[PDB]
UniProtKB/Swiss-Prot annotation:
Record text on subunit structure and interactions: Homodimer. Interacts with APOBEC3G. Does not interact with APOBEC1.
Species for this entry: Homo sapiens
UniProt remark on domains: The CMP/dCMP deaminase domain 1 mediates RNA binding, RNA-dependent oligomerization and virion incorporation whereas the CMP/dCMP deaminase domain 2 confers deoxycytidine deaminase activity and substrate sequence specificity.
Subcellular localization, as worded in the UniProt entry: Nucleus
Residues at the active site: E62
Designated name of the protein: DNA dC->dU-editing enzyme APOBEC-3B
Transmembrane spans: none
Other information: It is one of seven related genes or pseudogenes found in a cluster, thought to result from gene duplication, on chromosome 22.
Amino acid sequence: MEILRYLMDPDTFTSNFNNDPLVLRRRQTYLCYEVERLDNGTSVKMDQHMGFLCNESGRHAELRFLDLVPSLQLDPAQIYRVTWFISWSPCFSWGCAGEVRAFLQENTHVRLRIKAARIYDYDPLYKEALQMLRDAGAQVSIMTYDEFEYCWDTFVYRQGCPFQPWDGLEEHSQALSGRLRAILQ
Ligand SMILES: [Zn+2]
């Protein structure tokens, strides 16, 4: 879904990206993506390569992004930074980490930056997933206030309304980042 055509409902964003542990949004993932062409030491933003995806009929959003990479028309002679703002860290047991790993092996012109709102520890191999992504070249981190507000401002039908932080955004982000950094050693 291209933000040029459709922006995300605000409550869809809040419901899915809130990082409070006691709220349980296990059913869905929202993956906001953007692309930049790394040109000789500079980032060239590609405004049309921006959108968001959710799981659809059992197909995880991470696989659906890989599905559309061909339509992005990336030049394999160039270099690109793909950034994911994703509500859940990619999974291992349903294939996302392996598929993303394979994509990065055979698409070396792409560098993946994954910023996750929450760790998907419902997957018993969530740690194996994070390590496989790191070992594949992806830089994985936890979203902070800065990332949440950027996604609000970029991907949401907010109508000039500024980002309204949920309670404890900062505390949960710190704890999640400490967990992630420990996992990735
Ligand atoms: Zn998955």
